[PDB]
Amino acid sequence: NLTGDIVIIGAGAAGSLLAHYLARFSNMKIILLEAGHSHFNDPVVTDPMGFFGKYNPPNENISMSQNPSYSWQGAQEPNTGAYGNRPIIAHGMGFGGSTMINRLNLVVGGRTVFDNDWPVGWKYDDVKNYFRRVLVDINPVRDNTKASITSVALDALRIIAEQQIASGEPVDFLLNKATGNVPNVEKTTPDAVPLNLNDYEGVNSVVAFSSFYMGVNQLSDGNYIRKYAGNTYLNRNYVDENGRGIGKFSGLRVVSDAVVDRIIFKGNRAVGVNYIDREGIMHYVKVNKEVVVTSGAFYTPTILQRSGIGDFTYLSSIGVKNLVYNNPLVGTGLKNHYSPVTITRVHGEPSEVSRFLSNMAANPTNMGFKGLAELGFHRLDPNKPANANTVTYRKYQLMMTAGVGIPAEQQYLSGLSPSSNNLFTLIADDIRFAPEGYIKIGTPNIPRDVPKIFFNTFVTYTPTSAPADQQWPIAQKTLAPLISALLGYDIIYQTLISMNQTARDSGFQVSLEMVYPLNDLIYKLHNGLATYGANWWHYFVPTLVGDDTPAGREFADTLSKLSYYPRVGAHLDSHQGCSCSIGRTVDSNLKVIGTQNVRVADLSAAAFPPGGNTWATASMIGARAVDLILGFPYLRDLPVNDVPILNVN
Amino acid sequence: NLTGDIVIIGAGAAGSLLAHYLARFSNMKIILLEAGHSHFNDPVVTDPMGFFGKYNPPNENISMSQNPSYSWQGAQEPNTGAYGNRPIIAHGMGFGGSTMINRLNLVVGGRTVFDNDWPVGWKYDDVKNYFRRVLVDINPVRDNTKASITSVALDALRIIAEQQIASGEPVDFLLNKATGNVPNVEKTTPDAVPLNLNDYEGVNSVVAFSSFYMGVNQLSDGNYIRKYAGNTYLNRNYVDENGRGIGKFSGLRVVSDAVVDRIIFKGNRAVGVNYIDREGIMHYVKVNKEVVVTSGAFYTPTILQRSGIGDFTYLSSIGVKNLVYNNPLVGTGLKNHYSPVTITRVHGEPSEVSRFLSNMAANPTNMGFKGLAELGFHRLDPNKPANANTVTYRKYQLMMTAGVGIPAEQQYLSGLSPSSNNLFTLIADDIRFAPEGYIKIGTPNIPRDVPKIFFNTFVTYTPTSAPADQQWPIAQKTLAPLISALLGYDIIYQTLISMNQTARDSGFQVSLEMVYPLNDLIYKLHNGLATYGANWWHYFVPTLVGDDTPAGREFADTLSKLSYYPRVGAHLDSHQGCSCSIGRTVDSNLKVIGTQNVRVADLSAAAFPPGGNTWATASMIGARAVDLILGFPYLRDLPVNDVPILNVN
Ligand SMILES: Cc1cc2nc3c(=O)[nH]c(=O)nc-3n(C[C@H](O)[C@H](O)[C@H](O)COP(=O)(O)OP(=O)(O)OC[C@H]3O[C@@H](n4cnc5c(N)ncnc54)[C@H](O)[C@@H]3O)c2cc1C
Ligand SMILES: Cc1cc2nc3c(=O)[nH]c(=O)nc-3n(C[C@H](O)[C@H](O)[C@H](O)COP(=O)(O)OP(=O)(O)OC[C@H]3O[C@@H](n4cnc5c(N)ncnc54)[C@H](O)[C@@H]3O)c2cc1C
Numbered sequence A, B: 001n002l003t004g005d006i007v008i009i010g011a012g013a014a015g016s017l018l019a020h021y022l023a024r025f026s027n028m029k030i031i032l033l034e035a036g037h038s039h040f041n042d043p044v045v046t047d048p049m050g051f052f053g054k055y056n057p058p059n060e061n062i063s064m065s066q067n068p069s070y071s072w073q074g075a076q077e078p079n080t081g082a083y084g085n086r087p088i089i090a091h092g093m094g095f096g097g098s099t100m101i102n103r104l105n106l107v108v109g110g111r112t113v114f115d116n117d118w119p120v121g122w123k124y125d126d127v128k129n130y131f132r133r134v135l136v137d138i139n140p141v142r143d144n145t146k147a148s149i150t151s152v153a154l155d156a157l158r159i160i161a162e163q164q165i166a167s168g169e170p171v172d173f174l175l176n177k178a179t180g181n182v183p184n185v186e187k188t189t190p191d192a193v194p195l196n197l198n199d200y201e202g203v204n205s206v207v208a209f210s211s212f213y214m215g216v217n218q219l220s221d222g223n224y225i226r227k228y229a230g231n232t233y234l235n236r237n238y239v240d241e242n243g244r245g246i247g248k249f250s251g252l253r254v255v256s257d258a259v260v261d262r263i264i265f266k267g268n269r270a271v272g273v274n275y276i277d278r279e280g281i282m283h284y285v286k287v288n289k290e291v292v293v294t295s296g297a298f299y300t301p302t303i304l305q306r307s308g309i310g311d312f313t314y315l316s317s318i319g320v321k322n323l324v325y326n327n328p329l330v331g332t333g334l335k336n337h338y339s340p341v342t343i344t345r346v347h348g349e350p351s352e353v354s355r356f357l358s359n360m361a362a363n364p365t366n367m368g369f370k371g372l373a374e375l376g377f378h379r380l381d382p383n384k385p386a387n388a389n390t391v392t393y394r395k396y397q398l399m400m401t402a403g404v405g406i407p408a409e410q411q412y413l414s415g416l417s418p419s420s421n422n423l424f425t426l427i428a429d430d431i432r433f434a435p436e437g438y439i440k441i442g443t444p445n446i447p448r449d450v451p452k453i454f455f456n457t458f459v460t461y462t463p464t465s466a467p468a469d470q471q472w473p474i475a476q477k478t479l480a481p482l483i484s485a486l487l488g489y490d491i492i493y494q495t496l497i498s499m500n501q502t503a504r505d506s507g508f509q510v511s512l513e514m515v516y517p518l519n520d521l522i523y524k525l526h527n528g529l530a531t532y533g534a535n536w537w538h539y540f541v542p543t544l545v546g547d548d549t550p551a552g553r554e555f556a557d558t559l560s561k562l563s564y565y566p567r568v569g570a571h572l573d574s575h576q577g578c579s580c581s582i583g584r585t586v587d588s589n590l591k592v593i594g595t596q597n598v599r600v601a602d603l604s605a606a607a608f609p610p611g612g613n614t615w616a617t618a619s620m621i622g623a624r625a626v627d628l629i630l631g632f633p634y635l636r637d638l639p640v641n642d643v644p645i646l647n648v649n
Helices: A015-024 A048-052 A112-117 A128-138 A148-167 A229-233 A247-251 A300-306 A312-318 A350-356 A408-414 A468-478 A480-506 A519-540 A550-562 A615-630 B015-024 B048-052 B112-116 B128-138 B149-167 B229-233 B299-307 B312-318 B350-356 B408-414 B468-478 B480-506 B519-540 B550-562 B564-568 B615-630
Strands: A002-009 A030-033 A071-075 A088-092 A216-218 A224-226 A252-255 A259-265 A270-276 A282-293 A332-334 A338-347 A373-375 A396-402 A423-430 A437-440 A452-454 A511-514 A570-572 A598-600 B002-009 B030-033 B071-075 B088-092 B216-218 B224-226 B252-255 B259-265 B270-276 B282-293 B332-334 B338-347 B373-375 B396-402 B423-430 B437-440 B452-454 B511-514 B570-572 B598-600
Touching: A002 A015, A002 A252, A015 A030, A015 A229, A015 A247, A015 A252, A015 A615, A048 A224, A071 B071, A128 A615, A148 A396, A148 A480, A247 A252, A259 A282, A259 A300, A282 A300, A282 A615, A300 A437, A338 A350, A338 A480, A396 A480, A423 A480, A468 A480, A468 A519, A480 A511, A480 A519, A480 A550, A511 A519, A519 A550, B002 B015, B002 B252, B015 B030, B015 B229, B015 B252, B015 B615, B048 B224, B128 B615, B149 B480, B259 B299, B282 B299, B282 B615, B299 B437, B338 B350, B338 B480, B338 B564, B396 B480, B423 B480, B468 B480, B468 B519, B480 B511, B480 B519, B480 B550, B480 B564, B511 B519, B519 B550, B550 B564, B564 B570
Parallel strands: A002 A030, A002 A282, A030 A252, A282 A598, B002 B030, B002 B282, B030 B252, B282 B598
Antiparallel strands: A071 A088, A216 A224, A259 A270, A270 A282, A332 A437, A338 A423, A338 A511, A338 A570, A373 A396, A396 A423, A437 A452, B071 B088, B216 B224, B259 B270, B270 B282, B332 B437, B338 B423, B338 B511, B338 B570, B373 B396, B396 B423, B437 B452
């Protein structure tokens, strides 16, 4: 049988890095088991434009995230806050994990989140040397082309930031403490210097920029290739076609097309793993030292539960025979991101509006991301951290995209046909999303694509027969996402109001207004904010604050109407994590509480979602697990000029 | 280990009956493999009202169809005809298959379908005995609490039938060929004899009645029970707690909590079956004579495909190792039913309207169904069989229910809240629904909840650069479902128009006007149908017709607006089948083409969907397969008085 010291389950954004840098620096046998197989010769994945449906048959025009042959299909239970919808969120299958099917963006997360929201031993100064290693291994690139809309938006944001600085409010969405009174907005001159948002020292927390960073590499021919975990750490230089290492890496052995279900125990120690190959044959893998599980946010708690780690009552209810430890917290507290969307129309003569929206197409260099800014807390938002007036946090990730990002049903309902050529998309992402859920298994026989996922986004609050004063804190806690989404809409509105004058100044004779969010409603919401200030959100429950005045009814009706759009006119991001975070299931050394020699090293073990995209954080967790297992800080001391070599075929 | 003579996979609506009567009438060892366990002591399933959520926890309020512990979650690929959404359809998991979580509505299917759409040897005179056996074994009951608007609707239908008969059209939705010139509308007299829609001779193909037949049995205590296949054929009288037969059924052996993946062949003949138990240990079962697969419409083709039966090219591409027989037709031609929904509002004084909609609440005997008729083709339907001038066909199933059956999003959008006490629902279910699809697997490792399911219903038509004279037939073939939906709306409108006068005559002083589908649009549709006759549907493509008058533009606009409602304001029925039909995957004796000793005996092996619900048809397939396997007409000649004995506990 197969025998080895360390067994890694799941070759995702962290498993590949862990296996690579663990086989390099040691001499013990390593086995990596992955559900899928390699895709180095598949044009759909390697080409960056294969993400947008470039090599798909006419009768099967679906993306990789909706394809069962590329990803798992984690259907969730009905959403009580979104009219009982059941969105599908996917995890990749094969070498590279979910990074094989993603947008290839890279955001670091910032300094404030790690300093304030993560436990001791995982502060920014302890993880920046691994962020640097991950970034230098991926080696992303910036945008090459540049449109005139970016400069106009940057100038409008600069004017807004100057106004906010002069106003003197302690907290705003365009203030940064580490810079001072100078707005942190890129210059619009042709010879300007870019403002990197992934700075080593984390100076840029609320920064307006001109470009993102995409994980692509230009090839000697002239085309681009997708740079992800699979071809970076598990390419032909290190792993051959038999799943064996070459040279120094001869210790590592990779098994392909192997789905695992259980971990065998001798009471407190893992002693084996069982999996099934392509012929339906059950195989058993001996474990000598340790087991590391990196199956992702959705499927790590399930494999933990069906092995006998969780609530004993429910596990005996469903029918688990072998039980090991009692953690009623396994699989609880799952976090994610959300992104409401906005559409804008441009008015004027066809020639000027055609010159205005030019040079904003999509190429493997930008992936449709013009990129505007990372924003802070709106001054009217009541739910802020305790020291939000001292250190600046990240809440919004502003983005700009061509075309219209809207489900076809809303496209028909609103009348904004994508065939039009005078519309563009602004998105105010939320990277501090409040709702939390949990995961439980349904049947204790085999891995299944659909466990029980509960995740309610925009719920409503029901009044009770109590004085309003003590009820208000409950309503404030319950209605956070709605307030955040509406304040993001207001942010976009102010940006458009400033950008009208900015564009008129820059030499474009055009005008702009919102169209999808029913500009009348946005204008009324802005007026209501301006006239009500801090207590504006009390109108979400008009019964307890009844004005008996036409203005009050008007504001309540407008707030009720605007609550409809974030439920349907938006989409969920596939940035789920924190389901098995540190402090609930594992300690600071990534060891499962109650056992001896098993560890979790994926995004599920994250204490708090990073302030942005989540590719780099999982790789950082894996890199830290490397020298936690080894015991010596090899990666933290590895020279920067040492990077893995790339083999294409 | 385990050895036997016949191995049955899946104890569904057909496997239960087949195993029961095959163990009764023979002397050979029989093994039944099921992926679930008995629910005889679970109030959610045994109580008929548990379907609506009578015993659900407040924080897990989900129906049995949406619960992963009760059913398989069959997610499908985006539907290009309904704005690209992915509805979820389930098969029940446990003793009784999908009959354990269904609405318990029993419809035989009709006679014309089995006389014009099934091969020789499967005509109505060869299946009526098995239909009678299934019906007497289940022993349904009729509704006990008769309402008042049922009589009003029946009188309106009688008036419409009189008008249609006096007119002289060859075909319409209230003409029955096997009844003469007398309308087939049930009497409204106090002592009226019931009209049975499941009659032995099949004379009622277009019949208007007052109550359906549902599978519930009244206990001596007073409360009702759910009488499905699981407790009918697999109760404690016959199968013990371990899973062994009792007395005469000593040859049976039932294995619970067993999921199968493979069928082991020896070149052309099955020799074994593999399954995984609750503990997670792979087991092997020997086969001596026969293997029968009854895993359902979705999951029987998957089992066949990953076993080595199907398109060799795709199977080899996805990694299937062993290939047995090449047949690219496996998993093709999937059919299902679609039910648009209509909402009506009643006007009048509160007392009269309150007493008008009385005695229509849902109780365990009618389950919210009052039932109207099995209607026929509309006179203006262009896509109808040529045989329709001699025989009558079932196309529309008409049902009524209190409250509003609408997704919450459309409930909010249309302004029709469920709190109103003056609304009721009319549903015209399409039972000759045209579109078809196919099923493919993604990974050759283990059974999965989500394989590739393609099903596109409301696809539109794009004109080409050709003369209209040859373009018209293709457009006529493509646009059938929209035509059927609009004609159903017109049928409901006519029924309401007649019901207004009938109610005003019967004593009530009220007015009924349809609301949800935007009455003005329906009025315009009715006027346009009357004006344009047979060629009304030509205006789905206003460019190709060449009409430019304001009337033509208005009619085209109305036809465009109305097409929005069927896509979203409806829900797909779980009556899927015909994916391994007779003559394409199996012969007339249910043996799989190209193989030696395996058969399929479920709803997937049906040649054409019946005119109504599909439980009885699946049970009939199983019952017929019983005596085909045995070779003697045991069940056809069994006396009607010999029925199984119920054993609740
Ligand atoms: C469509 C999409 C777009 C995204 N875009 C971005 C983006 O722009 N920026 C960003 O930062 N992040 C993005 N992400 C998220 C990013 O891809 C992941 O967060 C990241 O890969 C984290 O990796 P992980 O190891 O934690 O999880 P995964 O990469 O999902 O790890 C799962 C791995 O484990 C394997 N596995 C799972 N279950 C089993 C099992 N039972 N047995 C064996 N193996 C198993 C899988 O085959 C896979 O190899 C996107 C994700 C998706 C789905
Ligand atoms: C919500 C709902 C309501 C319905 N209402 C009605 C109604 O009112 N009237 C009506 O006539 N019909 C109704 N139906 C449909 C009806 O219940 C089914 O069509 C009928 O049971 C068909 O029987 P079958 O054996 O073909 O499918 P099923 O009974 O669903 O057969 C599936 C069986 O196979 C087993 N199985 C599947 N895969 C495997 C595997 N890999 N290994 C082992 N076992 C496996 C399952 O555990 C299950 O026992 C409804 C269905 C649903 C979902």
